[PDB]
Structure 1
């Protein structure tokens, strides 16, 4: 069915035209400076992607969500998390940063930018709705889980660097509001005060024992809240969900003035997202930025373990027909950007995630097609 191939090409190749246009602008024609490219990327991440996410989340009703598809996706991610946990806590080389990066590679594809257009072209509008469900679920649950993991990593590094000898005695953390996140870019000073009852209180501000679960839970919860209240995508997804709920429970259409005020900048979503992705491709001196062997490992994870674990989860749940094919092909999408972002700010295998994103993007068509043809047999 070469007509279906041409339809998929028509739907997907505009994104690559934009991406290659940006890549040539930075490499061939040198139209943009690195800081100008960074400015375009910042505009994208702050306005174009959050507004595109708001658009997609608001235009689908949460009450018609396919619960079985959601269960299949969450089961894939739960299987990945369980395997990673038992690998990290029962292995000599088991590690937390590797757990996070493997979770991102094997479970978090690019569902917003390329996923929705591609899957709509490949299967239909219902597939677009399913992809948007995956997008909302991912931005609300799994990116927040990534935030929890990254903040735990930062807190653990700070604890091991500040008070390793007697970290167990700490009972409460008080972080001044100036400390936005525990990324590690800024140095965080710590002071310890002994209480009347012999207890220890730690205060952290801007310049081998585990404390109780409650103390770390409090610290991570407050820090995660402080980073969520400053994440454009968090507000986008929340406000979109609330608006969708109210507008599909009471059938209330948004006023045309507000709808167009949002669309004027959301219409620049796909194009600017792909343009900034091309700018990033060009800026990076490498294309396989994490080494050939480990890059091959990351590609293999993304395009086999993602689809394979999604398949086992889907047949376990009971998905069949075009729904199972949509699930698997979605799992075979190129690795998402937001996990790469978090990896970059937290400097946790950022090269692996960059290679994932860009390389998979420009080899996502052959693999995704092969998947579609193979599943069609």
Structure 2
């Protein structure tokens, strides 16, 4: 009914291609030694500047902004705000790596981990099967919200952190670096388009659609490839260590879903919407935050280890959360 041995195969089939691309990249960088560190950085930069922005535009444009659930958006925003508050407060007392400082980069890493899960590739096969078609729409809205708001805010935070190493000048520099990002323009053009298309009926010219799909089609595969390329340069598969890996897992699969449950209860969600909203926050970490961290070199090892170890822990964790919510 809710779970069978055929939907588990669907989850495994959704997860395996990503790991295959990851392993291909890792072998290429380490064993085959096809790519040098500069070439790996170039591949990651191409993914960050052309693949992710075009994926974001494709996701946002094909979503009706006027059919989005206001309560889902409020729940997502409240979850992000609660996670930010918790990360800011905890860092005030307990600081990773001995209390050196840099509490803004740690908040960026914590937001990349906790509140930006992989919602489409791995979140569809399990949640849609367990619940149905409502889960599909909810997850699509969540992914649209990610690409539209949360990636842009994450990039702004990355640029603000980079600018920090009198305050208004730093914010101005971060903003100036943002308004040249392909991602902010992707989100703006995508939302403007979506509005025109779903309110005026305009259809994207076939030439432009094909042009976008030509370069954006392999975005996810290249993101996993870049993750493997980065892993090839690390001493061990757990690049961040055992303690930091445990902390990453706790943030992703306990803090994330717990604060999402708090957000859903505060917003007073009900039924399938509530259940899918609090179950999607337990989905694995996702690779776009890793791409941004690698581009800005902000603890990419932690994000990569979380991504690698979350794709395996998602299914048991999603099943555990489903069973917990059932009774």
Paired residues of 1:80 and 1:107 also in contact (CA < 8 A): yes
Residue 45, structure 1, aligned to residue 48, structure 2 = yes
Mind listing any 5+ residue stretches in structure 2 that lack a counterpart? none
1:262 to 194, 212, 230: 212
Match of 1:10 in 2: 13
Q: 1:375 to 1:9 in 2, by over 3 A?
A: farther
> How far 1:67 sits from its partner (Å)?
1.2
Task: Kindly report which structure 2 residues correspond to 1:89-168, keeping only aligned pairs within 5 A, or say none.
Answer: 91=93, 96-97=103-104, 98-111=106-119, 114-115=122-123, 123=131, 126-147=134-155, 149-150=157-158, 153=161
Match of 1:357 in 2: 307
Q: Higher strand proportion, which one?
A: 1
Residue 79, structure 1, aligned to residue 82, structure 2 = yes
Counterpart secondary structure, 1:19:
helix
1:67 to 58, 64, 70: 70
Q: How far, CA to CA, are the matches of 1:270 and 1:138 in structure 2?
A: 16
Query: Which aligned segments of 4 or more residues in structure 1 are displaced greater than 6 angstroms?
Result: none
Paired residues of 1:12 and 1:117 also in contact (CA < 8 A): no
TM-score normalised per structure 1? 0.72
Deviates most, 364-373 or 6-15: 364-373
Q: 1:221 to 1:111 in 2, by over 3 A?
A: farther
Q: How far, CA to CA, are the matches of 1:308 and 1:260 in structure 2?
A: 41
Q: How far, CA to CA, are the matches of 2:46 and 2:321 in structure 1?
A: 34
Task: Kindly report which structure 2 residues correspond to 1:338-353, keeping only aligned pairs within 5 A, or say none.
Answer: 338-344=288-294, 347-353=297-303
2:232 to 282, 288, 300: 282
Q: Higher helix proportion, which one?
A: 2
> How far 1:305 sits from its partner (Å)?
0.8
Counterpart secondary structure, 2:6:
helix
Find the structure with the greater CA-based Rg.
1
Q: 1:13 to 1:264 in 2, by over 3 A?
A: same
Residue 323, structure 1, aligned to residue 273, structure 2 = yes
